[PDB]
Structure formats: C-alpha cells, structure tokens
Amino acid sequence: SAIGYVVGLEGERIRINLHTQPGDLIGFDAGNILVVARVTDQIIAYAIGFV
Amino acid sequence: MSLFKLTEISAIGYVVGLEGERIRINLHEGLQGRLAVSSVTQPGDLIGFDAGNILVVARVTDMAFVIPLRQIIAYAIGFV
Amino acid sequence: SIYQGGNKLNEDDFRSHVYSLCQLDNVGVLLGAGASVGCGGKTMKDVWKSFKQNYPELLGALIDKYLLVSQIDSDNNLVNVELLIDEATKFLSVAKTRRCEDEEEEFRKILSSLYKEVTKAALLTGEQFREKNQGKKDAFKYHKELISKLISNRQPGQSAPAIFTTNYDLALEWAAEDLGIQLFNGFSGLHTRQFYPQNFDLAFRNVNHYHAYLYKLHGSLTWYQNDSLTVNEVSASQAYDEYINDIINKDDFYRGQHLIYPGANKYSHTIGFVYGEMFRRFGEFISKPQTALFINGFGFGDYHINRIILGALLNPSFHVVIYYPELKEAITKVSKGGGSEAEKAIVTLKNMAFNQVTVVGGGSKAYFNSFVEHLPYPIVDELVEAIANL
Amino acid sequence: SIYQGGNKLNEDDFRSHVYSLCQLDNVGVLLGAGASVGCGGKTMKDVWKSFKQNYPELLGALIDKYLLVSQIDSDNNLVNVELLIDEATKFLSVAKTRRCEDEEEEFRKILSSLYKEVTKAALLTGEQFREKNQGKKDAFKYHKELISKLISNRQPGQSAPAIFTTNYDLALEWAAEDLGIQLFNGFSGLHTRQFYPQNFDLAFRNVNGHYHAYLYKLHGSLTWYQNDSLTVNEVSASQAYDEYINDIINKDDFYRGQHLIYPGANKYSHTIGFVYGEMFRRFGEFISKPQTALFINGFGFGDYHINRIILGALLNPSFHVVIYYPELKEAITKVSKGGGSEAEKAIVTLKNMAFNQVTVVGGGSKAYFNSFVEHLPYPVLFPRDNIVDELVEAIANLSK
Amino acid sequence: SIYQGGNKLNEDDFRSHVYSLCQLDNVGVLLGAGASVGCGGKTMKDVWKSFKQNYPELLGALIDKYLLVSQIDSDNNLVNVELLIDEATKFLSVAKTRRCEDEEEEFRKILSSLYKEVTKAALLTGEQFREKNQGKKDAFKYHKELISKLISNRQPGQSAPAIFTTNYDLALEWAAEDLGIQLFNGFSGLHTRQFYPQNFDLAFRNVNAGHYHAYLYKLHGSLTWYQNDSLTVNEVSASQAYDEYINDIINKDDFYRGQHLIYPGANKYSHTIGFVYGEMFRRFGEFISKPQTALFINGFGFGDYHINRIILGALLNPSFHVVIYYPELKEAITKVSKGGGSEAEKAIVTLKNMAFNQVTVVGGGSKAYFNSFVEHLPYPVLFPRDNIVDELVEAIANLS
Amino acid sequence: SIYQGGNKLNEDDFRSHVYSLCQLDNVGVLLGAGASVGCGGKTMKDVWKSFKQNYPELLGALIDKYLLVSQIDSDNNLVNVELLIDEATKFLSVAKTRRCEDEEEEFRKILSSLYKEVTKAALLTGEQFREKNQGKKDAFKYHKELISKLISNRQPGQSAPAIFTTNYDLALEWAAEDLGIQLFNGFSGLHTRQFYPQNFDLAFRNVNAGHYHAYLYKLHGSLTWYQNDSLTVNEVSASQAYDEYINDIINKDDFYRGQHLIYPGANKYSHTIGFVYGEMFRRFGEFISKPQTALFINGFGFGDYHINRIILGALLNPSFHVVIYYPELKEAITKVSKGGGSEAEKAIVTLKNMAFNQVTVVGGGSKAYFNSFVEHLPYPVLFPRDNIVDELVEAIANLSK
Numbered sequence A: 001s002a003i004g005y006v007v008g009l010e011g012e013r014i015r016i017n018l019h020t021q022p023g024d025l026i027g028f029d030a031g032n033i034l035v036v037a038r039v040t041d042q043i044i045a046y047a048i049g050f051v
Numbered sequence B: 001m002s003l004f005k006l007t008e009i010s011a012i013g014y015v016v017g018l019e020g021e022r023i024r025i026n027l028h029e030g031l032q033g034r035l036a037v038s039s040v041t042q043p044g045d046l047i048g049f050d051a052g053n054i055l056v057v058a059r060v061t062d063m064a065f066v067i068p069l070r071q072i073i074a075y076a077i078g079f080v
Numbered sequence C: 001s002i003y004q005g006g007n008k009l010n011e012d013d014f015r016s017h018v019y020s021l022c023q024l025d026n027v028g029v030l031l032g033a034g035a036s037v038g039c040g041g042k043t044m045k046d047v048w049k050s051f052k053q054n055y056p057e058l059l060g061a062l063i064d065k066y067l068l069v070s071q072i073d074s075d076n077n078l079v080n081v082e083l084l085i086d087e088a089t090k091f092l093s094v095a096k097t098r099r100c101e102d103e104e105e106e107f108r109k110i111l112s113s114l115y116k117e118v119t120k121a122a123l124l125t126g127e128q129f130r131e132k133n134q135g136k137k138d139a140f141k142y143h144k145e146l147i148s149k150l151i152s153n154r155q156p157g158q159s160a161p162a163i164f165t166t167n168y169d170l171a172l173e174w175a176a177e178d179l180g181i182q183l184f185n186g187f188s189g190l191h192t193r194q195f196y197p198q199n200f201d202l203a204f205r206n207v208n209h210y211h212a213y214l215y216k217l218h219g220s221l222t223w224y225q226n227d228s229l230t231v232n233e234v235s236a237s238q239a240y241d242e243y244i245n246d247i248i249n250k251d252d253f254y255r256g257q258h259l260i261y262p263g264a265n266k267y268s269h270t271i272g273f274v275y276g277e278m279f280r281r282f283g284e285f286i287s288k289p290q291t292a293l294f295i296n297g298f299g300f301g302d303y304h305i306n307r308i309i310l311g312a313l314l315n316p317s318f319h320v321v322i323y324y325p326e327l328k329e330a331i332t333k334v335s336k337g338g339g340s341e342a343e344k345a346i347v348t349l350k351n352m353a354f355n356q357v358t359v360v361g362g363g364s365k366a367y368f369n370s371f372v373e374h375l376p377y378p379i380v381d382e383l384v385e386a387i388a389n390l
Numbered sequence D: 001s002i003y004q005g006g007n008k009l010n011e012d013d014f015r016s017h018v019y020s021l022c023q024l025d026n027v028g029v030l031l032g033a034g035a036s037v038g039c040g041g042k043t044m045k046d047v048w049k050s051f052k053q054n055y056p057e058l059l060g061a062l063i064d065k066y067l068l069v070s071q072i073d074s075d076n077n078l079v080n081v082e083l084l085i086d087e088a089t090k091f092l093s094v095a096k097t098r099r100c101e102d103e104e105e106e107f108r109k110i111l112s113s114l115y116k117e118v119t120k121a122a123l124l125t126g127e128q129f130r131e132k133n134q135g136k137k138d139a140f141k142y143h144k145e146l147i148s149k150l151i152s153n154r155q156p157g158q159s160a161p162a163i164f165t166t167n168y169d170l171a172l173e174w175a176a177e178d179l180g181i182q183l184f185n186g187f188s189g190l191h192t193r194q195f196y197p198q199n200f201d202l203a204f205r206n207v208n209g210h211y212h213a214y215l216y217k218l219h220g221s222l223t224w225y226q227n228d229s230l231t232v233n234e235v236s237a238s239q240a241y242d243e244y245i246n247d248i249i250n251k252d253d254f255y256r257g258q259h260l261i262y263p264g265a266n267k268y269s270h271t272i273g274f275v276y277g278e279m280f281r282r283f284g285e286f287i288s289k290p291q292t293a294l295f296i297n298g299f300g301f302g303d304y305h306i307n308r309i310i311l312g313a314l315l316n317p318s319f320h321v322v323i324y325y326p327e328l329k330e331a332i333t334k335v336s337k338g339g340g341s342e343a344e345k346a347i348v349t350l351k352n353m354a355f356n357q358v359t360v361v362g363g364g365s366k367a368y369f370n371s372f373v374e375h376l377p378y379p380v381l382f383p384r385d386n387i388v389d390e391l392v393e394a395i396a397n398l399s400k
Numbered sequence E: 001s002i003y004q005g006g007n008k009l010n011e012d013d014f015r016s017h018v019y020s021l022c023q024l025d026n027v028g029v030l031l032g033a034g035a036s037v038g039c040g041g042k043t044m045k046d047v048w049k050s051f052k053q054n055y056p057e058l059l060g061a062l063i064d065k066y067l068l069v070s071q072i073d074s075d076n077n078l079v080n081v082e083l084l085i086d087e088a089t090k091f092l093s094v095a096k097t098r099r100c101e102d103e104e105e106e107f108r109k110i111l112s113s114l115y116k117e118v119t120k121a122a123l124l125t126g127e128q129f130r131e132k133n134q135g136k137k138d139a140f141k142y143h144k145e146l147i148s149k150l151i152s153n154r155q156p157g158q159s160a161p162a163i164f165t166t167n168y169d170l171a172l173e174w175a176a177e178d179l180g181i182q183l184f185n186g187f188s189g190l191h192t193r194q195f196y197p198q199n200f201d202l203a204f205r206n207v208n209a210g211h212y213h214a215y216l217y218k219l220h221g222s223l224t225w226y227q228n229d230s231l232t233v234n235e236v237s238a239s240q241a242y243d244e245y246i247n248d249i250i251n252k253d254d255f256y257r258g259q260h261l262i263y264p265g266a267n268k269y270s271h272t273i274g275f276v277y278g279e280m281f282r283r284f285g286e287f288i289s290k291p292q293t294a295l296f297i298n299g300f301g302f303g304d305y306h307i308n309r310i311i312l313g314a315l316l317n318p319s320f321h322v323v324i325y326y327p328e329l330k331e332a333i334t335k336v337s338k339g340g341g342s343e344a345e346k347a348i349v350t351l352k353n354m355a356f357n358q359v360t361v362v363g364g365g366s367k368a369y370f371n372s373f374v375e376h377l378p379y380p381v382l383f384p385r386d387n388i389v390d391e392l393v394e395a396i397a398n399l400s
Numbered sequence F: 001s002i003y004q005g006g007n008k009l010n011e012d013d014f015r016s017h018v019y020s021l022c023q024l025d026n027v028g029v030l031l032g033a034g035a036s037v038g039c040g041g042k043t044m045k046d047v048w049k050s051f052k053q054n055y056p057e058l059l060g061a062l063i064d065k066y067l068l069v070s071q072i073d074s075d076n077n078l079v080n081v082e083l084l085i086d087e088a089t090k091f092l093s094v095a096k097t098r099r100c101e102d103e104e105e106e107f108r109k110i111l112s113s114l115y116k117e118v119t120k121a122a123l124l125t126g127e128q129f130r131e132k133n134q135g136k137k138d139a140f141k142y143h144k145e146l147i148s149k150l151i152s153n154r155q156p157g158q159s160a161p162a163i164f165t166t167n168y169d170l171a172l173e174w175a176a177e178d179l180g181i182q183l184f185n186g187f188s189g190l191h192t193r194q195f196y197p198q199n200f201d202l203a204f205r206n207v208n209a210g211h212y213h214a215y216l217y218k219l220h221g222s223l224t225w226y227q228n229d230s231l232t233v234n235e236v237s238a239s240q241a242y243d244e245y246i247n248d249i250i251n252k253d254d255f256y257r258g259q260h261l262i263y264p265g266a267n268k269y270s271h272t273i274g275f276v277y278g279e280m281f282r283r284f285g286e287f288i289s290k291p292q293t294a295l296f297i298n299g300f301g302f303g304d305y306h307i308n309r310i311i312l313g314a315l316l317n318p319s320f321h322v323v324i325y326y327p328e329l330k331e332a333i334t335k336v337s338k339g340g341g342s343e344a345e346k347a348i349v350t351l352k353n354m355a356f357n358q359v360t361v362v363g364g365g366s367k368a369y370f371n372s373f374v375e376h377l378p379y380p381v382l383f384p385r386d387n388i389v390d391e392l393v394e395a396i397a398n399l400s401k
C-alpha cells in the first residue's frame, strides 16, 4: 500500500503528494536503510531516525 | 585515434540560470552511475564548479521536480 | 570474503550491485568445468588421477622416451590435458608421413586410452545418453533458472544475452529445449548440418518467441568431420550409434583426423577455422561499451584468456565479477616464495586500485548454485495425466 | 492451347500476363505427384501395376469372393487406390466386431501389402536414401531454379512465398539445403524435435537474412511419427531408415503406426490428427487475402476437399489462378459424348467460366514441370529509359 | 452447491462472477438434449425404454448374434443410441456389397424401427409440424430470452455470439424467426439450397451509417438435411420435408431408402457426408483456442470422449474459463468415493477436484436446469420491458 | 565467354552493366599475384622452378628420405609451396620437442632457403629497389590509370574506394606517390612509425570552408614491416630496409630469423600473437556486409580456404554484386565434367552454375588480363543533358536517304 510520494525537499522539511492525522509515523524505503518520519501539519513531515 | 586522450570528468548537472545569488542546476538523467567517488544528493552538501582558473565552492539548499526533470538551488561560499 | 580493490563488502551491498549491473546494455556469462560437477561432471585433477591408476604401464614412456609430461607435474596432479592431445596428434601425423610402423603403432594406444577416459566423464547420464527428454530430470534443475532470469530481465529493445562455455557436454542444450527457447550456435539444416559463421547476426520477430546465443570454445561431442572437407553436426542418438558407443566399449581402435574435441586437430586448415571464430567473437564482444561479465567455474589456467581479459580493462565501461573459491589459500602461498601462475594472476586482481573488479571467495559460498540465487527473480502435469488416463 | 475467360489466348500475351502476376503482394505454388517424376517418383498407376505383379493371390481373393474390384477395370488399369483402402478398412472393422478371425487376417495382409508398395515410391534414390549431400545431383536441377526465382522476386516490405505440397518425399528440402536457404515447417529443436502450431508466425531480422520461405505438407511426411502422447516428432533420413523403414521395405513386417501418412479418400476417419486441421486452416487463410496469385502444377484434380476449397475462392475479385493440365483436349471430348470421370468434369467446368481470372494451359508435354519453371522471369536490376534507345532503331525502318 | 477450485461460494459472488464473464472478447454456449425437454423433447434414456418395450424380438438377435450391444448396458439403460446406427449402416453396406441376400432384410428391418423411434421424439409439436408461426407458442419462451440476452450486450467492434448444439430439432430456428434475427448455418439459396463451408466468415453492414446476426453449428445434423440422387447436400423447409419423407417414416411400416438422411451421425463412411460433420468439429476446436474465451455448458451429459478430450486440452491456457451445470453432483460424489461409478461421473468429479480458479461447477437438482440458467445472465438497461406495439396492432386489426 | 546467372551475355550488355555498378555507394577491388606480372613479378610455379635448379641436394633429401614431395609432381610442376612450408614447420616442431639435434639443424636450411626465393621475387626492379622516383617508368602506367578511374567516379557525399591485396611488393604505393594521392594504411610518424588500428576512420577537411584519398589493406603483410622484441610493428622506407636487413638475406646465406613478417602459409590461425592479420580480416569482413556494394576480383587463383569461405557466405545479401576474372575457364569446365579436377577448379565452376543474376564470370584467356580489366572501366560524364532535345538531333541525324 501507499498514501503518496515525495515531490520536494526544503531544508529539513518533506512534502508528500497524496494520491492520517498529526502525530502519526510513516516510513520510507531507501534500500539498505528505512527512514521514519513524524507528521506535523499535501502534508509536511520531519525526520527522527532510521531503522 | 592516437594515444592522446583528454577528457576525464564525471559531472552531475550543468548551470541553467543565475538570479542574483541564486543558482539553478539541471541534473543529468543519462548517467547510469555517478560514481567516478563521492555522493551528493541531499541538502547540506558541498559542490564545486570549474572555471578554468579557480574552483568555486557552493552549498545545496533545495530540491524539487519540474521522465521528469529535477532541479537544485545552491549558494556560494568561496573558491580554491 | 568479498573484496573490491582491497576493501570489504557485506551481502546486501553486493546483492544490490549485481542488480544494478544486470540493467546495462550488454550482459554475458563465462562458465568452466566446475559448473557441470553438480550433474555428474568431473575436473582435470580427477581425470588425471583416474588415468594414472588405470594405465601405469605406459606412463613411463611419456616421461622417458618422448618427453611430453613433467615428473613434478605428474606427481602434483597439475597437467593440462588439452595440449597433450594436440602434441600426440602431431607426433602420430609425422610418424605416419615418414612411414615408421613401429612408432606409429605405439601412439595409437595412448590416444585410444586418453579419449576413453575423457569421453566417459562427459556423458553425464551413463547409458541414458541416447534417450529423449533428458533435461526434465532434477539434476538439470539450476541450469534452467539461469536462462529463465537472464532472458526475463531484458527490456523491450534490448539485445540478447550471450553465454560462453569451455565445456563440451550437452548440459545447456537439453535445458533450453525443455524450457522452450532457441539457441543459435552457428549451424543450420536437418539432413545435412553445416557451419556458417554469419548466422550469429540473426534475430526473430513477429509478423503481427525469444532466443539467446551460445559459443563453444573447445568443441562438442556431436561435431565431426567426414571424408568431404566440411564440418557436420548430428544428434545424441546418431552420434552414439555411429562412433561414441565403440570408444567406450572396445579395446583398441583409432580413427584419425575425425573428432573436433577437445581442441585436438589444429594442424588442419579445415578444423582450425571453427576454433578461431569463437575466439575472435569473444575478443570482439569483450571490447564493447557498457558491458558486464560474470565468471564462474574458471580456474584461470589459460594464458590467452588472461591476456584478453586484462587488456579489456583500459575502458571505464567494462565490469567484471569473479567467483574464486580458494582465495585465502592462495594469499597464504603468495606470502611465501612458492605458488603457481594461476594463483599469481588471481591474487594480482585482488590488489587492484579501482572499483571495477569484484572478487568473491569462501567455501561453499562461491559455487554454481550460489551464483544463481544472487540474480533477481523473474498444474500442467495434472491435466497431462488426466488426458493420458482417458 | 491457352484459354483465359473462356476465350483463346496467344503465347506473347501469356508471357506478359505471367510477368505482371509475379509483382503482386502474395504469390504461392501448389505441387502434386506429377512434379516428382523427373527425379524418380511414381504415380498411382505404377503402384497398381506393381501390386498386381507382386501379389497374384490376393488379387484373386479380391476379385472372386469379396467382389471389390471388377476384372475388366483391373485389366485396363483404371482402378482408384484411394477408394479401395477405405473399403478394406470398413470390411476389417465390420469383421472384427462380430469376432471372425480368418476373414480378419486376410484384410490385415491386404492393408500391409498395399501400404508397403506406397512407401517404396517415395524414396527416389533406392538404397542411397540414407547418405548425405543428395541435393548435389543433376536430378534436382529445376527445384533449385524454382526456389531461387521465387525468392528473388521480392521487394522490401512484402511477405515471403508459400509452397504447398501433397507428396511424402524430400525433394524441396534436399534442394534447399544444398542452396543455403532455411525453410519453416512448424518443428523446432534438434535432440527432441516437436510440432508447435504458433511457430508459423516467426520471421528473421538483422541485428544491425531476408532469404527464407514456408513449407506446408498437407498429407504428412515420411520422417514423422506420433508417440501416442498427442505429440509429433521429426527425425533425419538415416535415423528413420535405421529405425523402421528397413523393416517395412525388406522384412515384410506387419504394418503398424510407424509413420503417419494420409492415403485415402475420407481424411476425417482419423479423429486424433491435429496436424491436418492446422495445415488446412493455414491453406484456407491464404486464399482470402487481396492481391493473390496461385500457380498449380502436377495435380490430377481427384481430391474432394481441395477442389471444393478452390471453387469458393473465386468469389473474391482479387484472386487469380493458373492451372497446368496436359490432357485437356481428350477431357473436352468425353464430356460432350455423355461424361467422363469426376476428375474430368471439374477441369472442364473451370475452363468454361466467364471471368478473366481463370487460365488453363494444355498441350501435352509442354505443360510439364520443366516447362513451367522456364516461363517464370528473372528480376531486372537497373531499369532504363526506353525513350531514347528505342527511337535509334526507328531510323532504320525508313533507311532500309 | 457451487464450487470454484474446491471451495464453496454463495449466490451473490456467483452472480458477480457471471457478470464479469459476459464482457469478454469471445462468448459461446454449448447445449445438449436436456435443454429441449421443456418444449416436448425426451432424454436419451427415455428412448431405449420405448424401443425395448415396443420391439422385444429384435433385442435378442441384436445381442446374441451380432454382438452390437451388451446385456449390462441394456439392463441399466446406458446405451449410446447414436453410436449404434453408424455400425448398423456399415453392416448393411457390407452385406449389400458382398451380396448376402438373407442378411440385408434383417438390417433393413432394425433400422426402420430405430429411425421410427428417434424421429417421433424430435417433432416437438406432433402433427403441427408443417404449419407456420410455430414460435409464437409459450413453450419457446426461454429460447427467445437466451437469444435476446446474448445479442443485446455486445459493444461495437466486437465479435458475434456462437451457439453449438448436439440436438437436431428446429427449436432455435423457430425462436429466431420470431424476433427477426438472421442465423448463419452454412447454407444459401431458396430454390436449390446448398452447403458452402466458406460462408462462416461473413457479416452484415449498413450502407448509410444491422449488427443482428449469429452463428449456429449443428454437430449431429438436422431433420431437414438429405442427399439427393446427385452428390450434393440440400436443405428444405418443414412442410416440404413432411410431405416428402417424414410422413412415411412415422406412419408406413416397410420404408427404408438407404444413404439418404444426415441424422444422427449415420452415414459417415461416405466421403460426401462426413465432410459436413468434420467442419463443425474443426470450427468448434478453433473457437476455444482464442485468448479471451468464455464458455457456458448446460444440458450435456459428458458421454462423448472427443468433446471431453478437446475441452481438457484447452485448459492449459491461462485465459480460458468454463461454467458447467450437472444436477447430480452428490449421487456421483458418493459413488466415486466408495468404489467408483461410471465414466461420466469419474470425468466430472475429476474436473471438479481441480484446484484452478477457471473451472466452476454448479449442482442442486432443479436449481441447475435450463430455465434457471437464463436468469443468471445479465439484463440490459435499455431493453424495453413494456408492451406498446401489441395494443396498436390490435387497434389496427379492429378497424374495418 | 561471359556468364551471368549461368546464361550468356554479349559485350555491349556487359559494358552497360559495368557502367551501372560503378555508381553504387560502395566500390572495392581485390588483387592477386598475377596483377603484378607486367611490372616484373612472378608466380609460385616460377618460384618452384627456380628452387629446383639451385638447391638439388635439398630436393633429393626432400624426395628420398622424408617423403614430403613425390617424384612425379616435381617433374610436372604441381607442388604447392604453402603446404610444404606448413609440413616443414610441423616436422621441426616435433624435432625440437623430442630433442633430436641433427634433423632440427637439417630442416632449418630448407626453411631458410625457401623464404629467400619468395623475397627475391617481390622486388620487381632488382638492384634499383633502393632508389627514388620508381613510378615515373612506363611499367606502372595501368596502376595509375586504375587509381585515377576509381577516384574520379565518386559523387560528393559518398565514401572513398577501398583496395585489398595479397602481395608483398610496393607496386601500388609507387604509382600513387607519382600522382600526389594520399593512401591510408594505419601508420603514423616519420622517425618512428607504428601501427594503430584506430586511424582507419580519418578523412581530410579544408580549414577555409587535398580532396582525393583512398585506403589500402595488406592482408599477408608487407616487405617493409618488421616486428621488434617489444611486440610492436614498425615501418621504414625502401632504402633503409634494403641497407639494413634484406641485403644479408640475398647475398649472404642462412640469416632469416623473423626479420620481416609475412604469411606464406596455408593455415594462418596458428600464430596466436599476430593481431595485424586479425585486424585486416575484420575490416574485410565488415565491408561486404553493407547494402549497395560492388566488388571486382582480378589475379586471384582461388586457392585460399578463408577467402573462399568469406566470399560464398556473403552472397545471401540481395544487395551484393561480384565480377570474377579467370583466364582458364574452358579447361576447368572440361576437367570437372570427367569427375576429377583440382580443389581450386571446383570452386570457380560452382560459382558459374548458380542461378542468381548477382554473379558474373569473365573468361577468355588473354581477354581476362589486368590490362583488359583496366580498359573495361568507364570514364565519367562531366556535363550531362536532360537528353530530350539531343535525342531529337540524333533522330534527325541520318534520314536523308
């Protein structure tokens, strides 16, 4: 499944383009590393760490 | 044809515009692998441009869209 | 132990690297005698050991009277069984030309023995060599996957894969026939098959179904030459009925300039023409842009292949992956004075200074079966037996 | 001797007509049993003669008790062999159900003996059938010319020629292999060769050639056999001779399903035959395309299916046929006197049509296979103007 | 009881599955003799009872002398009726050819009784067979619904529906002539009707901008087909056939001509009659070998080896779908589980046990009948479900 | 005596056909050992005749003991030099391997005296080989005419002609250096000339916007090339080569040790280090695999297996045309019909009997020589007309009677 994709990066901010509320966590498949993010407010998210 | 060969360069893009301390770069798509070996695909990195006499050092700030096209914004900090 | 220019890598990075390489323009594979040992094959050391303890009554003549084999190599089991046959053929031809019966009768036994040992290890199925559907068995299970996920990966508009082989057994033909694809090897016809070099530039299309290429660098069991100065090809059953059956189950007989395996009769201008074409095609393919090469089962004991491979690394778009099992055992001998030419060559590539050579070592971790799994992924029987029941 | 549209035609116009008919989109040929007489073949009359010479007691059993063949018809050699095998099979099937053994054996003998004579006439070289390089001999001289002329009259963008046949012999294959051209017949592989219906849609291409054709054998081949597993395999000539042909020819073994061929009238008796249907489907798909030409040679017009298909193809106003029939005049006479055989009526009916798309050629020995190949033209490499050169000779007529 | 790959699903899922299968590239229907029992027909086991109740003297000579039928099959009413007529005709032909005078009358006396029984069960209207407008009765109400539903859900640029049947009655023709649709069956003409095998590749079009036609393949013949004195096959109307040869068969007691009729699968040994039978099977085999085919089976008893072999081999294609109706699943499952029953039961249970998502089997007695089969098919939105024409027609008739 | 597709055609049609073949995209020519006979050269039969009458004891040792040459073929002059060289090398190999000493030294004399006669026959001028302006003589007129006719017929935007040869002499470079044309052969430098495979793709260009050039391929080496110990091929001039390493070969005896590279043997795949030979044949095989290609063959005796195999397999392309010159066609036809004939005679007869209009064979004895071949080529037409009024003049010309 999926909820969207990434369209741009601005400093330390992530923009997600929709095809579910503040505080939820999301993940991005980057091959050898998985990146976890936190929703703050298209939606915006920040970064916390990697697994 | 003969022994002499000159060009050995591995670039990731070329300058497409200047707007008063603001640089736009269009990223190559035909490069199967940008390995020469360093990776610069993230804001906060350092890149350099060759101008024959000096090398200009810059810093990446933004990435965005618009086989789509990708763009990069950077700012200068000095030269070597 | 996985190295890249002296560094080290883990499993996941290599598994991503192999996937990245498979999406290039040109892809090829080179096999050896070690890739057929899982189906009933043998190696050079094994065949030499079998020869030593079966015919010891004439091994002295090869060292004393004629000087074809070295004592140290014989004791250490490091002989090359390909050059010896060519030298024996030259000796027999000269003796026959000079009309020396005594020496002529001596050389018809050494060849009759050597061919007898060589041919036995290549049947791969005993007396079932003359039957049909031999590629449907479980022994030939991993050979099919290689073809299946080499053809599938290629996008529309891409070229066809290439397979280079040093074996002379029918391991890659039965599997391809049972899969349902066609291999181009340079022959055409049914009632009279002949060698046409220019068939290597053909491809299929649809009027409104895939293929590959197969180059044999040392010959095959189904190739021979008749009274007419042309090279023919036959099937397994016809070959067994014609000449293969008598070689194994008879005491002593020899034909002459008849067979084309393994690299035997190179002094005839009709038989060297077919050996030269494969080498020139390999050389032309190795020097193309955006190419990859996977090597498996190769002992690095051939002088010319090493020269060809080394000279092709002057270009930046040539990638090589090697599977050598006894890596550390070679480094230990390199530390001391002794060693061998193959070991010296292989250890040199380990100490290179660029990210193009990738050597993979270990124990069972680098065999043929392990190599197949690294490549990316791509009910009839019930209906068949139901119809047969009716 | 030449009729087009029911009216007589001369030779000079015929040659020009033939030339312009080889430039269309689709061209094909159909060859019968008379086209292999210049290589060593035999017709159906010779089979009957050999059978009545070699087996004198089975003929008497056929004529006296079961009354399947009349004496006067046998004397004049005017008996049809295809219509006797069906009756023999019918008698055997009836006799096997009611459990009669002595009458059952006599028909197995007849069928085996009759198949044996049919097999002997399809080798063309006797005991040399198993050798190699049989296409280098002088007998197969005009087959190579036919293949070359057909394969050379093809502009880029067009389709490859198609050849249909009803023989069991390996004449076209022998001629083509000696020439270097590859033919497609539906089989693939070397160690295990099998039939694949979707292999008829393949074609060559150049990676950076253009010389091939298709072959359809409508009535089977002498090197094919079915292994009872709903699969058909193909072997070489030497392998077949070593496997089963020698036993049939020499050891007088009782006949079994060693090789699948179709001698007989009703071809639908064999229900599990799925090659005949595919072949005839491909044949029927050919004659429904616009801008098509077809040449027929060596056919006696004695098969219901083929001349039933041909008649329905003349309803398309882009289909042309040329028919070679030697004994046209003798067939014309016997129709006005009351009527001849069923084979002599179809050709007269075709001749008397009123469309300019049917051409019939007769004349005895000048409607043969060798004469047919000579009428085909060679391609012109570099064209000319013909306006400046042809007026050079215009001066001569006024100064001579 | 509904199975799809060995698992059960409810009615709503089955209806949803049926809806999705009706919008594919190819759609076909194959019907049997059980679909005409609601119009006045009889099944195959209701004819043997009548034959062995009305003619108890020939039955002994048909078992003890010629061995044409087994005692076990006769006692349980499991005799293939259409597989006996062909053998009887073969016996009669052999006896006539070899001139056994005493054996001709016996086989002329049993065929006269077999035809008299098979013919009377296919009229469907008794003596109202020569009249006109037979499709207006209430017995043929669901055939019209099936035909209308098949046609009225095809988008432009798509193929036309095909119908295969093992019957030889005139139900579908009567149903189609009332709606105004035209069916193609391979014949053309009015004063001399003839069989043309090439007219199966034709379609209609409008010269101004209709698409109202279908194909009907009859696999065992028809009541209205016969072979005249010549070698051709003709078709006539119901009244002409009744006045020509049906009345004598039903009424007269000593009437038998010879190789005249073409039902059911009788005179296959003649090469001008079996040619008709072969084409239908060939075109049936050609249809189900297409990429996106869906087939519905109803009324069939699965007693034919050739059709089963054809269907089984066609399932090794990942885009072929089959739906089967058999209202006796439980009585076959128990018998196969205990010791094993008849061949049809074994075939159906083996096909049910397959773990594919392509095969679906429906049982349940009266829930899997022909009448229930229609409602499972979708109904078009724009089809007029009202009555407006009849009132105006009656008002017009009332005038004057 | 001219055939096209097995039939016969006359002279006017042949000339009209030849004119049209020179207007195609790709044109080339392959020359043999008989094309240099009018300059001073000689063939292999003359080499054998010279050998037999200067080294009699060696011939006796060859016939009596080792049984390499028969007694009858020596008198009738049917010996083949290439096979003899290959057999001598094969004998020397086993002599070295078994460490026998006397026979190893014996075979060296034969193998060294056999090359000397080959080298002497490729000078074409004797003692004047080490001199300049050799192309001004009247013996090189037809070579110059051939080069001029080949170069002049090309249209702008087309490719340059290609020339292939199997001779060691310098008859074709001397002619070109007298006209001013530049020939590319894969070498660069003056004080040190080396071989580079990459410079076969070079062409001239004018800076303000030397337009005539061609290519030369030497398949069996050259008399001026030599290999140093560094496994590299170098080139010198005629005078330097004569004064440094081909004056001791002739006047002094038994001094050949790989001095200059040549391939007089039948099997040329034995040498597994030579890459010039493999480079030339790849270019040859690539040329005949293009559409709209024409080839002329003159002086070739059809006795090489590799070339014969290449030519036959290139006839399956419907855009390839060849013309073959052969003087003794009638004798070959007569001798093959008796069931015999040499291997060389079968190849030419097989080609003559094909049914394709893309093969033409020219015979006739002296009518198929080099001078006739050069004379059959056409001259360009510089200013053509639409020929719609000139043809009217031609029609009006002669009708006063």
Ligand SMILES: Nc1ncnc2c1ncn2[C@@H]1O[C@H](COP(=O)(O)OP(=O)(O)OC[C@H]2O[C@H](O)[C@H](O)[C@@H]2O)[C@@H](O)[C@H]1O
Pocket: C032, C033, C034, C035, C037, C038, C043, C044, C045, C080, C082, C083, C166, C218, C296, C297, C298, C299, C300, C301, C302, C325, C326, C366, C367, C368
């Ligand atoms: N199960 C195995 N899986 C993978 N590799 C294996 C295995 N077993 C052994 N090996 C490796 O595979 C190697 C096989 O060694 P040899 O068969 O002598 O090498 P070749 O086939 O190149 O030699 C023949 C050709 O090479 C010469 O030029 C000859 O003239 C021939 O042309 C072992 O040493 C192991 O490293």
Ligand SMILES: Nc1ncnc2c1ncn2[C@@H]1O[C@H](COP(=O)(O)OP(=O)(O)OC[C@H]2O[C@H](O)[C@H](O)[C@@H]2O)[C@@H](O)[C@H]1O
Pocket: D032, D033, D034, D035, D037, D038, D043, D044, D082, D166, D219, D262, D263, D264, D297, D298, D299, D300, D301, D302, D303, D326, D327, D367, D368, D369, D370
């Ligand atoms: N040299 C010749 N060239 C051409 N035609 C010739 C020649 N010599 C004779 N003919 C003519 O060739 C014809 C040969 O007559 P038949 O052998 O019955 O021809 P078929 O192949 O149709 O019959 C064979 C059966 O095989 C299948 O089973 C079909 O059912 C066929 O019935 C005559 O017209 C000769 O005049």
Ligand SMILES: Nc1ncnc2c1ncn2[C@@H]1O[C@H](COP(=O)(O)OP(=O)(O)OC[C@H]2O[C@H](O)[C@H](O)[C@@H]2O)[C@@H](O)[C@H]1O
Pocket: E032, E033, E034, E035, E037, E038, E043, E044, E045, E080, E082, E166, E299, E300, E301, E302, E303, E304, E305, E326, E327, E328, E368, E369, E370
């Ligand atoms: N009202 C009904 N509605 C639907 N199905 C019914 C009904 N009544 C009975 N059935 C079912 O209808 C079926 C009765 O089948 P039968 O008419 O005997 O067999 P066939 O028509 O296939 O026989 C002809 C073929 O079989 C020969 O072997 C030849 O090969 C022929 O091709 C049973 O399933 C009944 O339960």
Ligand SMILES: Nc1ncnc2c1ncn2[C@@H]1O[C@H](COP(=O)(O)OP(=O)(O)OC[C@H]2O[C@H](O)[C@H](O)[C@@H]2O)[C@@H](O)[C@H]1O
Pocket: F032, F033, F034, F035, F037, F038, F043, F044, F045, F166, F220, F264, F298, F299, F300, F301, F302, F303, F304, F327, F328, F368, F369, F370
């Ligand atoms: N004046 C002439 N002009 C043209 N052709 C001539 C002339 N005189 C003779 N010929 C013909 O020239 C033809 C060839 O004479 P040969 O010396 O046998 O040629 P080859 O077959 O050895 O081929 C030469 C090389 O081939 C090998 O690979 C070696 O490298 C050889 O050096 C004969 O048919 C003559 O009739």
